[PDB]
Amino acid sequence: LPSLLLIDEAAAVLGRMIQGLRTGIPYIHTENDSIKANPILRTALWQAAYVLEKAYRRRYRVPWTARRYMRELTPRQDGRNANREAVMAKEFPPGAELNVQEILPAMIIDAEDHILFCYLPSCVSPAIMTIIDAAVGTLATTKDGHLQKKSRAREGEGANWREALDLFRQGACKMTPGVLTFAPAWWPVGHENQLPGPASTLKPPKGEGRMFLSDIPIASALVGAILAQINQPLFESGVKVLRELYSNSKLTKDHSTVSKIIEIWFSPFSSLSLIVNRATPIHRDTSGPIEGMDILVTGGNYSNGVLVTPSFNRRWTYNPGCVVALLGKLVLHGVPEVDGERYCMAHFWRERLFDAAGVPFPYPSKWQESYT
Amino acid sequence: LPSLLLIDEAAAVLGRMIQGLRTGIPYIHTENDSIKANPILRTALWQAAYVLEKAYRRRYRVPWTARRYMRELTPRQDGRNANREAVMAKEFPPGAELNSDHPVQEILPAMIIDAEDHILFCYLPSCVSPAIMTIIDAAVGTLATTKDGHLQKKSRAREGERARKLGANWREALDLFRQGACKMTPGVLTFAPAWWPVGHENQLPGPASTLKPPKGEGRMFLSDIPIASALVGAILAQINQPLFESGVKVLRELYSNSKLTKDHSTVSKIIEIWFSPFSSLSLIVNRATPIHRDTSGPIEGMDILVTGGNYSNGVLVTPSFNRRWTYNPGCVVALLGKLVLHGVPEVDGERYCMAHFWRERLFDAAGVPFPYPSKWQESYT
Amino acid sequence: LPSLLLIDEAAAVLGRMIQGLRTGIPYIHTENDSIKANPILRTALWQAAYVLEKAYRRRYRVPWTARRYMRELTPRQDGRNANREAVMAKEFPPGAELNSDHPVQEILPAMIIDAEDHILFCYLPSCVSPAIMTIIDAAVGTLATTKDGHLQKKSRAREGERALGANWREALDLFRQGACKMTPGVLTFAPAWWPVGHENQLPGPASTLKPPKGEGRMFLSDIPIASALVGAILAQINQPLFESGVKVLRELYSNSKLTKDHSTVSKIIEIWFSPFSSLSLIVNRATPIHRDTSGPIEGMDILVTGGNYSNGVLVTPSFNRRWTYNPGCVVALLGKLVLHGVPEVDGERYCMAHFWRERLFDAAGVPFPYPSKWQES
Amino acid sequence: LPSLLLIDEAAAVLGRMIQGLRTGIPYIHTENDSIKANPILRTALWQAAYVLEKAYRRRYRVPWTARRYMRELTPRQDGRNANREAVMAKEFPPGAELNSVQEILPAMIIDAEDHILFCYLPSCVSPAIMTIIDAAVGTLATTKDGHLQKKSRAREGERARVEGANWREALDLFRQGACKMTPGVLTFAPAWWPVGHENQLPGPASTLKPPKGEGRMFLSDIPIASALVGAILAQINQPLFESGVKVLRELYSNSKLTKDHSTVSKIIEIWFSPFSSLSLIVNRATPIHRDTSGPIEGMDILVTGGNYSNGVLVTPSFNRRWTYNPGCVVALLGKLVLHGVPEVDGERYCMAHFWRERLFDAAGVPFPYPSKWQESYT
DNA sequence: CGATCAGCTACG
DNA sequence: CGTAGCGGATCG
DNA sequence: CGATCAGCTACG
DNA sequence: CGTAGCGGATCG
Ligand SMILES: O=C(O)CNC(=O)C(=O)O
Ligand SMILES: O=C(O)CNC(=O)C(=O)O
Ligand SMILES: O=C(O)CNC(=O)C(=O)O
Ligand SMILES: O=C(O)CNC(=O)C(=O)O
Ligand SMILES: [Mn+2]
Ligand SMILES: [Mn+2]
Ligand SMILES: [Mn+2]
Ligand SMILES: [Mn+2]
């Protein structure tokens, strides 16, 4: 599969670049691969390398380990319960380093050097941001696409807060607010009992979702390369899971479609969700494995984006081009209303795909693995 | 059709000659057929029989199957990526029969087979008889000494660049062509009865531009070498008989069925003077060849290279076999061009190469399945 | 657990000695581990390293892959069908390296590999140090001199009968006629095992091993260093199989919900110095040409022959070979692929066969691994 | 796959037995195979050899070729049209060897070019195997809520609700009265196209999909009988036998030719037959017909059993009636030869082994032309 | 997302 | 006469 | 459909 | 003690 080869090249090249920035000997790309043939990809990798090196040089530490924090969590603690969240705040305080709105790349590590949060502002190069803007605009401006049909279905008529109307941007939008999800292997609502299959959004071979994916393979390669810089075992394990889902047709239904989607799937993650013109309340993401690091990319036409992490006592500037990697099941996070239109791409995981593929899900990486 | 009958009979006769060499009961050509009508072809078939039997008795094996190698290759992996080639070389090494401390240049006819007895490479030095080599030399000289043929027109088309590693257009890069004193104009021409323009595999195929003038230089070169092409086709039938017969069937369907090609009477006229089971033939005059894989043909296609000219130091390099092969005039090499990395450095003189290769979409159009590579034992049946 | 620690360390040390022999920088054992605690084991490992390196330098190749050979075999093709064996011999011949110009019997260490570098057969003559051979001779003698041990009790049970095919392993045609110091017969040992036809219950301890101080448990206690040696050899030939067998034993020891009578099985494992599933002792029996069909396709079995005989031969027809099979000789082979037999010898002989049960791997949740390629050692 | 090896061994051994009967040098089975290990199979092969050798010595010839007959037939001419059948009877008469009661001796009908069109084999099946088949069919037709009883109540319900295009399940044909075995029709196949789903990829027959349903265990009860039938076919038409085996191997190997290929592979693993399909017709009379759903060149095999005394199979274009009592085997080009079986004085079942050419096309295996009888004697 | 492609005729 | 403008699924 | 199976507790 | 009767998916 050449797509997985491309994502490997992006990841490896990004690592060489970061190493060059650290040693003072600049990496010079000579190999004849996709990176030399596509300056947009090369430039985007260079920008991500700059931001990642800066973030790796600015590390805050909380006075507890992710393991104990996760053991105090209940299996579906998403942050709606104020009593238990106060319990968490007292048992796992921010610590002396964290007792201001940040703008500089940084990361939060636990007492045993595990990365819980990586803040990367302006990680995505303007070319790729333009590309993503165009793709999302095409998906959210179609007349009878999934988003418009859902948008009129909801006008005719927490708990399922991800599609609550109070959270969507009300006023002037050229992009249709809503939420869509894409994955080569997914279990539909209350179909979790069966084998996984392709997401409905991706099932038409020339539907709006498949073309949206075809519009952003280089953005997805960039996001995957960032993940590989932060957690290489997780990147490689996701790639192995994808390879196994491709090979072994007895793990999915409609495996023809799953294999095609994988062929145009330039990402090590299990799934990608697009949230258009919706505020995000403080929450924990409960649907993935404890150990999964998700990646958020925000874009649009706004100036006052903020991401709030209360258990770190921090607010982070969350403007177009900003990338955030985080343990979504551990870190409470939210994004208030912005002064304009916004979209978010959330790249995340399904542990059940991992056991099905026979690939262990790894524990979060320590930051020192960066420097080997 | 006399062309397809001629090459079919040449193939069958060559097989009988090789079998006689194997059993010790010499074949003696008795039938009153086209092979009796051309003593030159018969002599050349005997020489090919000698060299083919020798190569069939000297077989190296790599410790992997072509099928797994191809599954690891990407569809357009031509060898430009050195890191990817290092991955390939470590996952599919030459094996104990082929690794050595020092680079080995072979001189004896041989073949490389995979772990499942499929032929990947066949080395046949001095396969072509002096007579047929003389003929080919004369025909290629006629093509490359012309005053306003395709070769000089191409040399002028690049005249703006000239007076001013693979990559786009490497087959005609000026870096590779012979600088100095040449009797034959360096360049590349290609011939085919049915063919698709680059990027245009969406229409119906048509005749190659070189062959469209009914008395142009290309059709006249083609008419000059029907017995050399019969010999090349017969060799192919010895290495991969199903591919030979399937190519012949494809040609027959393209000839008969007129709704498969554009300009079909021209395609039929070319097929009538097409003494070859292959889809296409390319003539490369005075050009070195860098290490590459040919990525545009079917995975399972066996291509045939014939080299000639007046040079003494010819070498063909196969890195994934850890081998260099003496590649002097008259040498024939059959190889899975989409699997085998191969290149030819500059020689100390003038050289030309005839590359016979395939287009799977022609097989699809003709309704003929493309077969999987032959096992060597099928020769011995 | 000292059993698994001893065999793991023996395997690692043997690998280091073989590596030193290959590079020319001799391994020198400095660590304070199990190997220093047993100089006899260390000596035997050095001898095995020498013979293994010699065998690795003398490699014959068959012109086919084990995968294609096995795909043409039927799951219980033991060699009884002469037509089917002719089919196999014609479709999978010995090849040019094996058929043309060698002696009546081989005497030098060697191995047969397939077209994809997988090991099919490893001939290792004089592999066992004389000390360990003495030890095994004594333990097998102790098992075969008892009044009313299992060996004598089965010899009596064949009463009126005396006055391939089912039960060939104990056919009377094969056992030594005359006067024997050792009682001919067959015994089998395993920490977890299924009775024939009963792979539908939980596995339990081998019958021979259940008395806490019976003859079988003391034969096991007498040969821990011979078993550690055999296990280390196996790890040199197929490292994934060694480590996976060790994991299976570890799971059977830990997880008590896999076994019946799990305390007893735990004791057996504690004195089980071997990664193999099971061990069979064949005393004074010739062996007809056969394939062992009951184990996993990819399982490497190990045969050890001993006794006081001079004309021992192991016949592998599909390799066109006869191998000198005298006391101290070790043979590793894919029992499901390689036809092999041992004719009657001019004296008394015993064989220790170490082999596998794939259902054990399934029960322990450990996948059965693919055979290693020979270069990986 | 050991199943295909078993049927190959049965075919080869049967041929050796027939050769021994012809030369006068009896075959002696020495090989250590399934035939030596199973005396029931060996005895049954011996009986089939006796009857087949007798049938090959009694050959009638019609004065036309099967090819011209098929060329004059229309693609769905099943015999319902009396005008077309009168035309066929004038253009292809029985001929001087056949025009002129009920035959009882094993025989065969060949065409003007020695192709076998019909082989009559009375008491071909050994009593042991007939007992076995009786028991398996009785088990199939007595299951409490199995396919046959659910069909039969679907039939009573529709007859009651009322106050050929589906003649094979027409209610007039089934035995009315006292039956131990539930009348009906079932069909089994590893690769099959359901009604309404004939432009999809082939898949396993509905009857065989439950891994321990009544259909799969009926198949598990009669592998030795299925091996016997395949061996008979291999004696009459060896290329067809071997081509059916090749099609089965391709369907087993190539997982992209079928849906639910897991199930198809399991079924193939217990499919002891070179035929594409097997149908069981329990307690049903059979009107004169041609079978139109198979390849023109396909030779089907019928095995009849039960407890009846007056069984007859009618072939009008040969001007013949054939005694069709329990144990009788008939091989015939069902798409060419009109044939029918009247109601009998008791309970009866029929096992019909037949072909689907589309499976051969999918597997890339040509369907061969019917064998000539002389191929037996090579 | 820029590049790949064993080439060609329409047309200045 | 020469050469511009393809042409389009797919490749890393 | 009879045979295979590197064996064993339940019990006269 | 000694040994009868398993035991069941699968093999040709
Ligand atoms: O909307 C954003 O920027 C962040 N979104 C999330 O964390 C989410 O949807 O789970
Ligand atoms: O130049 C040679 O002899 C060989 N040439 C090639 O393989 C080629 O042009 O693709
Ligand atoms: O007797 C020997 O030395 C070898 N024995 C075997 O292979 C066996 O019992 O299966
Ligand atoms: O019922 C019988 O014996 C014969 N049956 C058939 O020919 C049939 O159903 O097509
Ligand atoms: Mn979230
Ligand atoms: Mn080439
Ligand atoms: Mn054995
Ligand atoms: Mn019928």
PDB file of all heavy atoms in Angstrom, chain B residues 74-76 80 198 200, chain F residues 6-8 10-12:
ATOM      1  N   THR B  74       5.575  -1.580  -4.791  1.00  0.00           N
ATOM      2  CA  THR B  74       4.482  -0.694  -5.150  1.00  0.00           C
ATOM      3  C   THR B  74       4.346  -0.628  -6.668  1.00  0.00           C
ATOM      4  O   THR B  74       5.304  -0.906  -7.401  1.00  0.00           O
ATOM      5  CB  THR B  74       4.712   0.696  -4.555  1.00  0.00           C
ATOM      6  OG1 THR B  74       6.006   1.184  -4.930  1.00  0.00           O
ATOM      7  CG2 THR B  74       4.616   0.639  -3.042  1.00  0.00           C
ATOM      8  N   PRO B  75       3.160  -0.290  -7.180  1.00  0.00           N
ATOM      9  CA  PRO B  75       2.914  -0.446  -8.626  1.00  0.00           C
ATOM     10  C   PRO B  75       3.817   0.390  -9.522  1.00  0.00           C
ATOM     11  O   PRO B  75       3.942   0.076 -10.712  1.00  0.00           O
ATOM     12  CB  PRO B  75       1.443  -0.035  -8.775  1.00  0.00           C
ATOM     13  CG  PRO B  75       0.853  -0.303  -7.428  1.00  0.00           C
ATOM     14  CD  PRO B  75       1.929   0.065  -6.454  1.00  0.00           C
ATOM     15  N   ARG B  76       4.461   1.435  -9.007  1.00  0.00           N
ATOM     16  CA  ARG B  76       5.356   2.232  -9.834  1.00  0.00           C
ATOM     17  C   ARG B  76       6.713   2.402  -9.162  1.00  0.00           C
ATOM     18  O   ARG B  76       7.367   3.437  -9.310  1.00  0.00           O
ATOM     19  CB  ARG B  76       4.724   3.581 -10.183  1.00  0.00           C
ATOM     20  CG  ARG B  76       3.885   3.498 -11.461  1.00  0.00           C
ATOM     21  CD  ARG B  76       2.947   4.689 -11.684  1.00  0.00           C
ATOM     22  NE  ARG B  76       3.312   5.881 -10.927  1.00  0.00           N
ATOM     23  CZ  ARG B  76       2.465   6.867 -10.645  1.00  0.00           C
ATOM     24  NH1 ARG B  76       1.203   6.800 -11.060  1.00  0.00           N
ATOM     25  NH2 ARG B  76       2.878   7.918  -9.946  1.00  0.00           N
ATOM     26  N   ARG B  80      13.913   4.381  -8.002  1.00  0.00           N
ATOM     27  CA  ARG B  80      14.442   5.709  -7.707  1.00  0.00           C
ATOM     28  C   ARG B  80      14.721   5.914  -6.220  1.00  0.00           C
ATOM     29  O   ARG B  80      15.566   6.745  -5.873  1.00  0.00           O
ATOM     30  CB  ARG B  80      13.460   6.777  -8.201  1.00  0.00           C
ATOM     31  CG  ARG B  80      12.231   6.937  -7.320  1.00  0.00           C
ATOM     32  CD  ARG B  80      11.164   7.809  -7.966  1.00  0.00           C
ATOM     33  NE  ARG B  80       9.904   7.768  -7.222  1.00  0.00           N
ATOM     34  CZ  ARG B  80       9.008   6.787  -7.315  1.00  0.00           C
ATOM     35  NH1 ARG B  80       9.226   5.755  -8.118  1.00  0.00           N
ATOM     36  NH2 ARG B  80       7.892   6.837  -6.601  1.00  0.00           N
ATOM     37  N   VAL B 198       0.729   8.011 -24.125  1.00  0.00           N
ATOM     38  CA  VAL B 198       0.933   8.282 -22.707  1.00  0.00           C
ATOM     39  C   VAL B 198      -0.243   9.084 -22.169  1.00  0.00           C
ATOM     40  O   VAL B 198      -0.591  10.140 -22.710  1.00  0.00           O
ATOM     41  CB  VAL B 198       2.258   9.031 -22.484  1.00  0.00           C
ATOM     42  CG1 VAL B 198       2.368   9.487 -21.047  1.00  0.00           C
ATOM     43  CG2 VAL B 198       3.434   8.151 -22.865  1.00  0.00           C
ATOM     44  N   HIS B 200      -3.250   8.397 -22.345  1.00  0.00           N
ATOM     45  CA  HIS B 200      -4.450   8.220 -23.170  1.00  0.00           C
ATOM     46  C   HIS B 200      -4.897   6.772 -23.241  1.00  0.00           C
ATOM     47  O   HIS B 200      -5.238   6.416 -24.292  1.00  0.00           O
ATOM     48  CB  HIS B 200      -4.167   8.827 -24.541  1.00  0.00           C
ATOM     49  CG  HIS B 200      -3.785  10.266 -24.529  1.00  0.00           C
ATOM     50  ND1 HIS B 200      -4.533  11.225 -25.102  1.00  0.00           N
ATOM     51  CD2 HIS B 200      -2.737  10.901 -24.021  1.00  0.00           C
ATOM     52  CE1 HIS B 200      -3.957  12.354 -24.953  1.00  0.00           C
ATOM     53  NE2 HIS B 200      -2.897  12.185 -24.314  1.00  0.00           N
TER      54      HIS B 200
ATOM     55  P    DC F   6      -4.609  21.434 -22.409  1.00  0.00           P
ATOM     56  OP1  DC F   6      -6.064  21.214 -22.549  1.00  0.00           O
ATOM     57  OP2  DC F   6      -4.106  22.645 -21.721  1.00  0.00           O
ATOM     58  O5'  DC F   6      -3.947  20.157 -21.698  1.00  0.00           O
ATOM     59  C5'  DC F   6      -4.694  18.944 -21.562  1.00  0.00           C
ATOM     60  C4'  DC F   6      -4.672  18.138 -22.855  1.00  0.00           C
ATOM     61  O4'  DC F   6      -3.320  18.094 -23.390  1.00  0.00           O
ATOM     62  C3'  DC F   6      -5.111  16.677 -22.719  1.00  0.00           C
ATOM     63  O3'  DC F   6      -5.840  16.287 -23.878  1.00  0.00           O
ATOM     64  C2'  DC F   6      -3.780  15.935 -22.627  1.00  0.00           C
ATOM     65  C1'  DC F   6      -2.943  16.746 -23.590  1.00  0.00           C
ATOM     66  N1   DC F   6      -1.462  16.622 -23.414  1.00  0.00           N
ATOM     67  C2   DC F   6      -0.783  15.559 -24.019  1.00  0.00           C
ATOM     68  O2   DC F   6      -1.429  14.724 -24.659  1.00  0.00           O
ATOM     69  N3   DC F   6       0.564  15.475 -23.877  1.00  0.00           N
ATOM     70  C4   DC F   6       1.219  16.403 -23.176  1.00  0.00           C
ATOM     71  N4   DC F   6       2.545  16.283 -23.061  1.00  0.00           N
ATOM     72  C5   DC F   6       0.545  17.497 -22.564  1.00  0.00           C
ATOM     73  C6   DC F   6      -0.781  17.570 -22.711  1.00  0.00           C
ATOM     74  P    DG F   7      -7.424  16.027 -23.793  1.00  0.00           P
ATOM     75  OP1  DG F   7      -7.884  15.689 -25.160  1.00  0.00           O
ATOM     76  OP2  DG F   7      -8.026  17.157 -23.049  1.00  0.00           O
ATOM     77  O5'  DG F   7      -7.567  14.731 -22.872  1.00  0.00           O
ATOM     78  C5'  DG F   7      -7.247  13.450 -23.395  1.00  0.00           C
ATOM     79  C4'  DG F   7      -6.611  12.592 -22.325  1.00  0.00           C
ATOM     80  O4'  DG F   7      -5.264  13.037 -22.118  1.00  0.00           O
ATOM     81  C3'  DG F   7      -7.257  12.699 -20.954  1.00  0.00           C
ATOM     82  O3'  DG F   7      -8.336  11.766 -20.853  1.00  0.00           O
ATOM     83  C2'  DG F   7      -6.110  12.340 -20.005  1.00  0.00           C
ATOM     84  C1'  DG F   7      -4.848  12.651 -20.830  1.00  0.00           C
ATOM     85  N9   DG F   7      -4.016  13.710 -20.267  1.00  0.00           N
ATOM     86  C8   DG F   7      -4.439  14.803 -19.554  1.00  0.00           C
ATOM     87  N7   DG F   7      -3.466  15.580 -19.168  1.00  0.00           N
ATOM     88  C5   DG F   7      -2.323  14.963 -19.654  1.00  0.00           C
ATOM     89  C6   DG F   7      -0.966  15.345 -19.548  1.00  0.00           C
ATOM     90  O6   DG F   7      -0.492  16.340 -18.984  1.00  0.00           O
ATOM     91  N1   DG F   7      -0.122  14.438 -20.187  1.00  0.00           N
ATOM     92  C2   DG F   7      -0.539  13.302 -20.841  1.00  0.00           C
ATOM     93  N2   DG F   7       0.424  12.550 -21.392  1.00  0.00           N
ATOM     94  N3   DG F   7      -1.808  12.929 -20.943  1.00  0.00           N
ATOM     95  C4   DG F   7      -2.643  13.805 -20.328  1.00  0.00           C
ATOM     96  P    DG F   8      -9.559  12.033 -19.843  1.00  0.00           P
ATOM     97  OP1  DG F   8     -10.780  11.481 -20.470  1.00  0.00           O
ATOM     98  OP2  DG F   8      -9.489  13.442 -19.397  1.00  0.00           O
ATOM     99  O5'  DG F   8      -9.220  11.147 -18.567  1.00  0.00           O
ATOM    100  C5'  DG F   8      -8.715   9.843 -18.726  1.00  0.00           C
ATOM    101  C4'  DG F   8      -8.140   9.348 -17.420  1.00  0.00           C
ATOM    102  O4'  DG F   8      -6.741   9.719 -17.341  1.00  0.00           O
ATOM    103  C3'  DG F   8      -8.799   9.925 -16.164  1.00  0.00           C
ATOM    104  O3'  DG F   8      -8.865   8.917 -15.188  1.00  0.00           O
ATOM    105  C2'  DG F   8      -7.825  11.022 -15.747  1.00  0.00           C
ATOM    106  C1'  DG F   8      -6.500  10.374 -16.119  1.00  0.00           C
ATOM    107  N9   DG F   8      -5.414  11.326 -16.320  1.00  0.00           N
ATOM    108  C8   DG F   8      -5.507  12.697 -16.350  1.00  0.00           C
ATOM    109  N7   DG F   8      -4.359  13.287 -16.557  1.00  0.00           N
ATOM    110  C5   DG F   8      -3.452  12.240 -16.677  1.00  0.00           C
ATOM    111  C6   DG F   8      -2.060  12.262 -16.912  1.00  0.00           C
ATOM    112  O6   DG F   8      -1.321  13.245 -17.065  1.00  0.00           O
ATOM    113  N1   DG F   8      -1.526  10.976 -16.962  1.00  0.00           N
ATOM    114  C2   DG F   8      -2.247   9.816 -16.810  1.00  0.00           C
ATOM    115  N2   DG F   8      -1.558   8.667 -16.888  1.00  0.00           N
ATOM    116  N3   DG F   8      -3.554   9.782 -16.588  1.00  0.00           N
ATOM    117  C4   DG F   8      -4.088  11.027 -16.537  1.00  0.00           C
ATOM    118  P    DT F  10      -7.504   3.675 -10.131  1.00  0.00           P
ATOM    119  OP1  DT F  10      -7.563   2.200 -10.223  1.00  0.00           O
ATOM    120  OP2  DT F  10      -8.486   4.425  -9.315  1.00  0.00           O
ATOM    121  O5'  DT F  10      -6.055   4.090  -9.628  1.00  0.00           O
ATOM    122  C5'  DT F  10      -4.923   3.548 -10.267  1.00  0.00           C
ATOM    123  C4'  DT F  10      -3.693   4.357  -9.931  1.00  0.00           C
ATOM    124  O4'  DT F  10      -3.854   5.751 -10.303  1.00  0.00           O
ATOM    125  C3'  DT F  10      -3.296   4.365  -8.444  1.00  0.00           C
ATOM    126  O3'  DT F  10      -1.962   4.006  -8.365  1.00  0.00           O
ATOM    127  C2'  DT F  10      -3.468   5.835  -8.060  1.00  0.00           C
ATOM    128  C1'  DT F  10      -3.095   6.475  -9.378  1.00  0.00           C
ATOM    129  N1   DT F  10      -3.375   7.942  -9.490  1.00  0.00           N
ATOM    130  C2   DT F  10      -2.323   8.779  -9.772  1.00  0.00           C
ATOM    131  O2   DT F  10      -1.189   8.379  -9.948  1.00  0.00           O
ATOM    132  N3   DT F  10      -2.645  10.103  -9.861  1.00  0.00           N
ATOM    133  C4   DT F  10      -3.888  10.672  -9.683  1.00  0.00           C
ATOM    134  O4   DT F  10      -4.071  11.881  -9.784  1.00  0.00           O
ATOM    135  C5   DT F  10      -4.957   9.743  -9.375  1.00  0.00           C
ATOM    136  C7   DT F  10      -6.355  10.246  -9.161  1.00  0.00           C
ATOM    137  C6   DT F  10      -4.652   8.431  -9.290  1.00  0.00           C
ATOM    138  P    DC F  11      -1.448   2.810  -7.437  1.00  0.00           P
ATOM    139  OP1  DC F  11      -1.419   1.612  -8.310  1.00  0.00           O
ATOM    140  OP2  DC F  11      -2.198   2.764  -6.163  1.00  0.00           O
ATOM    141  O5'  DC F  11       0.053   3.272  -7.172  1.00  0.00           O
ATOM    142  C5'  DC F  11       0.819   3.698  -8.287  1.00  0.00           C
ATOM    143  C4'  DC F  11       1.687   4.896  -7.944  1.00  0.00           C
ATOM    144  O4'  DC F  11       0.939   6.138  -8.019  1.00  0.00           O
ATOM    145  C3'  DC F  11       2.321   4.876  -6.566  1.00  0.00           C
ATOM    146  O3'  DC F  11       3.664   5.239  -6.720  1.00  0.00           O
ATOM    147  C2'  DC F  11       1.524   5.948  -5.793  1.00  0.00           C
ATOM    148  C1'  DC F  11       1.285   6.937  -6.909  1.00  0.00           C
ATOM    149  N1   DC F  11       0.191   7.942  -6.704  1.00  0.00           N
ATOM    150  C2   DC F  11       0.481   9.295  -6.886  1.00  0.00           C
ATOM    151  O2   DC F  11       1.646   9.621  -7.151  1.00  0.00           O
ATOM    152  N3   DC F  11      -0.514  10.208  -6.757  1.00  0.00           N
ATOM    153  C4   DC F  11      -1.759   9.804  -6.473  1.00  0.00           C
ATOM    154  N4   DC F  11      -2.709  10.741  -6.356  1.00  0.00           N
ATOM    155  C5   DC F  11      -2.080   8.423  -6.304  1.00  0.00           C
ATOM    156  C6   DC F  11      -1.083   7.533  -6.434  1.00  0.00           C
ATOM    157  P    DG F  12       4.799   4.344  -6.048  1.00  0.00           P
ATOM    158  OP1  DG F  12       6.129   4.940  -6.298  1.00  0.00           O
ATOM    159  OP2  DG F  12       4.540   2.974  -6.548  1.00  0.00           O
ATOM    160  O5'  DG F  12       4.461   4.496  -4.489  1.00  0.00           O
ATOM    161  C5'  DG F  12       5.495   4.744  -3.569  1.00  0.00           C
ATOM    162  C4'  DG F  12       5.687   6.238  -3.365  1.00  0.00           C
ATOM    163  O4'  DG F  12       4.486   6.963  -3.770  1.00  0.00           O
ATOM    164  C3'  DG F  12       5.968   6.663  -1.926  1.00  0.00           C
ATOM    165  O3'  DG F  12       6.975   7.670  -1.914  1.00  0.00           O
ATOM    166  C2'  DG F  12       4.619   7.208  -1.454  1.00  0.00           C
ATOM    167  C1'  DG F  12       4.100   7.837  -2.733  1.00  0.00           C
ATOM    168  N9   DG F  12       2.650   8.027  -2.761  1.00  0.00           N
ATOM    169  C8   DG F  12       1.678   7.083  -2.532  1.00  0.00           C
ATOM    170  N7   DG F  12       0.461   7.553  -2.626  1.00  0.00           N
ATOM    171  C5   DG F  12       0.641   8.897  -2.936  1.00  0.00           C
ATOM    172  C6   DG F  12      -0.314   9.920  -3.159  1.00  0.00           C
ATOM    173  O6   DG F  12      -1.549   9.838  -3.138  1.00  0.00           O
ATOM    174  N1   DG F  12       0.297  11.141  -3.444  1.00  0.00           N
ATOM    175  C2   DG F  12       1.655  11.346  -3.498  1.00  0.00           C
ATOM    176  N2   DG F  12       2.065  12.589  -3.788  1.00  0.00           N
ATOM    177  N3   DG F  12       2.556  10.394  -3.291  1.00  0.00           N
ATOM    178  C4   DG F  12       1.980   9.201  -3.020  1.00  0.00           C
TER     179       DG F  12
END
